[model samples]
Target chain A: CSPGIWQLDCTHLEGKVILVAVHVASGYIEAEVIPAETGQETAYFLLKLAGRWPVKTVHTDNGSNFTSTTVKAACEWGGIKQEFGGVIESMNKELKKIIGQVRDQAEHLKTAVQMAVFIHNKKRKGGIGGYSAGERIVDIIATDIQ
Target chain B: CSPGIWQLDCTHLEGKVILVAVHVASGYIEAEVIPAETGQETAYFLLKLAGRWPVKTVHTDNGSNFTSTTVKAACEWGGIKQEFGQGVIESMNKELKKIIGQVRDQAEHLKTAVQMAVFIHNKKRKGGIGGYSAGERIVDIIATDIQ
Candidate 1:
């Protein structure tokens, strides 16, 4: 089933905020374009996408957005464990490291983020026989879509 | 704000939430360049722009994006009342008269249009006090932004 961890976090780009959750095992991700940073906005946004992924546990930091009761309850009902992990944290950190490569404009940041995510999904990793992270989710997502 | 009314609606012009917030009082509008219609994205987009506009209470229909707790709490924090502004939230006045009408929208162009339409509408040929454009009418016109 490719069950995995959910690394959640938000970053500032241009004048906007981007909240993202990565399906750590499959390398699939969903990002939302947000206006500001708040516990409710980030927590709710992550839960919505978490519902779509075949996740058994979600790993996020101790940030208010990640630790809120609403989010914890949602995970509890879905049978997904919520906690913290390193791989996902590394992903978010890498994102910020690369985020500054683009100019401070929403349009530029938008395109850059899309491109970065796209390449990441298509990237072949050293393990799992070199299949892109996207390849792992295809079977799971396809079955659901079908 | 002029405090007359507010118009809220959604359109699939390309593929996104594409939420429109227009002030019936001022004829001033702000459209969110959404990546999609999910409550999280929708909630965040609207909250981000809420500061840029002078809204007292908000009027939106039963759209999932508006009714979702994400948006509701965000609105509450801003002190903007949440109520049904109109029934059905129809797709009327889809075009931004002065500028959006001048161009055609393909998925490629729609993104560009969304970004520029608000600026152009704010910069209509006519000017108000100090001969400033709609930019000034709604918010201060920072010359550095345009130049």
Candidate 2:
């Protein structure tokens, strides 16, 4: 298994905030809309993401939300190292575009975020061959097991 | 020129801070290595960028550097509106990291690396957009504006 670096960042849109976690190797993303970009919410999502997939290191910007004690403590509890990085800006831009496109039928920001995340994972993005990121994750895991 | 929205963001590299501006319409980029990510430096580059191209709106995250009075005053003076935006810049920041990792030597100035990265990005061809580079697009935009 490649070193799993969880690239986490938050984006704000139309009065809503979303914490997005990207699997660096697979580009598989997990996102959640929070009440605000607070340490508690960051920690909650961090733990939830860890439960879904193994995380070796959590990389983020120097934003206070990612630097909060709650997030630190959760990382410690999960035996995950903490580091800082950026460039999820592209993902944030694409997500915003998707949410805007589906806004008419989304009914709420929560659904919009979900739909955007799903589209991102399912789309055949560049840099990872012609396979969707979700498919890449499966391939990576299958190879790991074999 | 379609409201001429310019997206600005800062990314760090080896203890250096680089401010990058992307012209949303043409995807052309102008970037510089600033001493720090402070409001003064942000304002300085903002003004420099305004001199380079027409900027109707300067979009950035709600970082203090972009929100400072210095930046606000500069924007007012330039008659540019400020809004919060992201994404295109994060993508650029990612590419910058790759460029630095490749061409950077044992002891080269980080600023030079940033300049090289910006130049390469503006010159790269895209799959769509008529196969023109961002710099090529900017050239066309300038020509059309002159007409």
Best by lDDT: 2
- Can you tell me the CAPRI class of model 2? incorrect
TM-score of each: 0.43, 0.47
TM-score of chain B of 2: 0.88
Instruction: Specify the highest-TM-score model's number.
Output: 2
The alpha-carbon deviation from the true structure for residue A83 of candidate 1, after best TM-score superposition, in angstroms, is 2.1
Off by over 4 Å in 2: A1-3, A125-129, B1-147
For model 2, what is the error of residue A118's alpha carbon versus the real structure, in angstroms, after optimal superposition? 0.9
For candidate 1, what is the DockQ?
Answer: 0.02
CA lDDT scores, all candidates in order: 0.55, 0.71
Alpha-carbon RMSD, each predicted model: 19.8, 22.3
- Quote model 2's TM-score: 0.47
